[PDB]
Amino acid sequence: WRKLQLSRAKLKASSKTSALLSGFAMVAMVEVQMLIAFAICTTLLVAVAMLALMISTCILPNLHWYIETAWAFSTLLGLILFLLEIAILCWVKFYDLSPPAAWSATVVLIPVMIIFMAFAIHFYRSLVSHKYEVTVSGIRELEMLKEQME
Amino acid sequence: WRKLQLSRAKLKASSKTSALLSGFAMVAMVEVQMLIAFAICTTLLVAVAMLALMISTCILPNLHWYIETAWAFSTLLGLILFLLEIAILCWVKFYDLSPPAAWSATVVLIPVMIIFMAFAIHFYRSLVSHKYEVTVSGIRELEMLKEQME
Amino acid sequence: WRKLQLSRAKLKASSKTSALLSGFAMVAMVEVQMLIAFAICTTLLVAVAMLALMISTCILPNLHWYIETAWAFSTLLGLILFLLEIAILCWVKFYDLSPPAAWSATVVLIPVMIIFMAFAIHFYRSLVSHKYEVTVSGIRELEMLKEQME
Amino acid sequence: WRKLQLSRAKLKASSKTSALLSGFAMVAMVEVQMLIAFAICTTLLVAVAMLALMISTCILPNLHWYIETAWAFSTLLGLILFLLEIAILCWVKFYDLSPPAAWSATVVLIPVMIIFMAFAIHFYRSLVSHKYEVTVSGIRELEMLKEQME
Amino acid sequence: WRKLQLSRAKLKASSKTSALLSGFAMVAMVEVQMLIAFAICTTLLVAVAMLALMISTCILPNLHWYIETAWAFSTLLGLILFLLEIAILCWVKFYDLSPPAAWSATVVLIPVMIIFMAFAIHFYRSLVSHKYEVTVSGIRELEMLKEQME
Amino acid sequence: WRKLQLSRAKLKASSKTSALLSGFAMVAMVEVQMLIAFAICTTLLVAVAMLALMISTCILPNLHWYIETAWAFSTLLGLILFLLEIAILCWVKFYDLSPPAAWSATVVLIPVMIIFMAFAIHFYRSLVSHKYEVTVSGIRELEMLKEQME
């Protein structure tokens, strides 16, 4: 039961989060009109969303942890992209007459981008340790019962 | 009971997903203003949505698997279109002064587009294997009872 | 009980579907600025929605099948209009510098428009047949009881 | 109990319906920039909404039918205004280069506007008749109990 | 229990109502570009919302009537501002070439603005009377029990 | 149980509040096009949101008070930023031809900004006192039981 809920929380969370961001990016992209990177970041980011969306289409009809990875990865990947795209936008909006102000965007981006990925590693690190922590405590308890059994 | 839920999940999911994307595409289309393809992709994509919408209008009043196909097909079909349309937009925004950057959009599109359709086949393949697999598991037991029966 | 639910499903479904589409059409209409038809399609489409909206206002306070027709008709009518309006938009956005690409919009429109209305007839046809089908099967059963009754 | 629900359905329905329409009208108004009427219709329509909004703020804390009238009136009044404003918009967006097409907007407006108000009268008429229809049937039943009482 | 609900109804109601209006005002403000007043009204109105938002952040963690005042005041205060800002917008959109039409906006504003604040006083007035009305009826009943007690 | 709810209320509240504000800021930023500060405020504000978003991604899978701080801090921090950004916008829209009207924005900003942060301290101050207030009342009750125990 806990398995389905985990996925469902992932199902709707991704769809709504992904669709609104892609639409906002598309609307802002047509308004203003590094140079080449802009076209790629936008198109690719959208795809990350599309797949997660379909995941929602196929999940209900139907290993559980495997598909789980697809969502956490795709969704988390996008977050980096959204902030990634905005950094470029400032470069696009200012890059013309405002280049001076534009630099502050990409430069300030590095401090936050690192913390975001770095924090993800720390949270994940503590988690793995627990997987091993439970494995040790679990076998120890089984020996206590097996020893008194004799 | 499970039959109605499957459709309902399809009923609302399609409507909301379809209406927002079509509106965003229409808004961005009027802002910027391959050449001919742009007009077609937009208009057609909308239709895919419209039908699915009506499906919601007729389903509640009222074979179940048949209609089911219409939704999975129409919805999945649209996803390819949305990402399909954005690729063209970059070409519409850059195609003028930025043609160089525009190419990265359609090119990068191929890698993701293939994986999307390809993954769909794999998921479907595993599903079919089970449908038949079960058919074998069910009858097998029946023969067991039959032999012991007599 | 089933009667109220059928209407309620119609009550909210129409309001949300109608209001968002009219607003999107109004926003895109002011951005770009067959010629005369454009003004009519937009204004009329909105009205179809407005009435359905009020239907929601008057229904709760308060023959059931009669009002039911108004919703199914108005809502379905709009779907044709939305796709109808977009076809014109392509003709409006392109009609200036892109007239060549514009034709593909209206032409491609015919294939989908027909299928939409045509499919509606088929679904409705099967429904009517069943209504009669049940009417015959029902009376036949009552005669079986009435005959053995003697 | 039925009394509170009727109002609540009115409470949220008005707020959401009113706020989104006013914002859309304000956004489109600044984009394009009968002549004088435009400014009035927009500002006034908003007010109709604002009051209804506050009605929601004061209702929860705290004759019931009296306040009820304020909502039905304000909300219904707005619907006429929204379609009213769009008619003017076409006159504003086309009034420049497209004056010819503009006329089709106001003219086509008359057919729907009449039906909207006319239909409201019919629905209300049937309602009043029932109120009296029940008053007659009710007293009749009481006399049946009073007569057999003797 | 009734205390928490009253606040919660206030918690979400304010956040959604405030955030959407501020964003719409900001979007329309950048599109057009009394003169000085415009900048102030917009910035200040936003603040009124921000505080109410935080109120939602601090309320859940944790006198009840005191905080209650902050919401009713801030929210109601904003309503006047929104209609206030729109009156200025008409003056901003028309103030250039359309000054004549602009006047109708601010002038027509006075009639509705007064009724809004005036009606608020009346509703509040009747409320204060009841508070006292209950205080009198309550003590009277307690004496009835205390008298027969002897 | 109360622990999970507190976080959940924080989970969705932050995501919706953060995503809409960042999109509105991005849309308005591209429309108009202190000078350098504008680029930074926008980019940084977004980051504050992104992290909070991920917090929602990692919380469900899995000390409680620690993570709690991250949300209250990030969310509250943003509020100051949103109003902060708008102050700059007025300076961006007016800063060109309207510099005079622009000053009223930043100046008026100080009065509200202080109250916002100042009020936060007061609410927090009363809270801390209670933490100590309970600590004293609690130990006192335990002694009452321990004393009569002898």
Numbering used by the authors:
A (entry chain B), B (entry chain C), C (entry chain D), D (entry chain E), E (entry chain F), F (entry chain A): 148 to 180, 191 to 219, 240 to 327
Provide excerpts from the study.
In this study, we introduced the corresponding amino acid substitution into Drosophila Orai (H206A), confirmed that it generates a constitutively active channel, and determined its X-ray structure. Thus, as has been shown for the corresponding H134A mutation of human Orai1, H206A Oraicryst forms an open channel that recapitulates properties of STIM-activated Orai. Extensive optimization of crystallization conditions improved the quality of H206A Oraicryst crystals from an initial diffraction limit of 20 Å resolution to 6.7 Å resolution. In this case, the asymmetric unit contains 24 Orai subunits, which are arranged as four complete channels. The X-ray structure of H206A Oraicryst reveals a new conformation of the channel with a dilated pore that presumably represents an open conformation. In comparison to the closed pore, the pore is dramatically dilated on its cytosolic end, expanding by ~10 Å at Lys159. The electron density indicates that the principal conformational change in the pore results from an outward rigid body rotation of the M1-M4a portion of each subunit away from the central axis and a slight additional outward bend of M1 on its intracellular half. Residue 206 is located on the M2 helix and does not line the pore. In the H206A Oraicryst structure, M4b and M4-ext are repositioned by straightenings of both bends such that the regions corresponding to M4a, M4b and M4-ext of each subunit form a continuous α-helix that traverses the membrane and extends ~45 Å into the cytosolic space. Anomalous difference electron density for iron is not observed in the structure of H206A Oraicryst, indicating that the iron complex is not present in the open pore, which is in accord with the dramatic widening of the basic region.
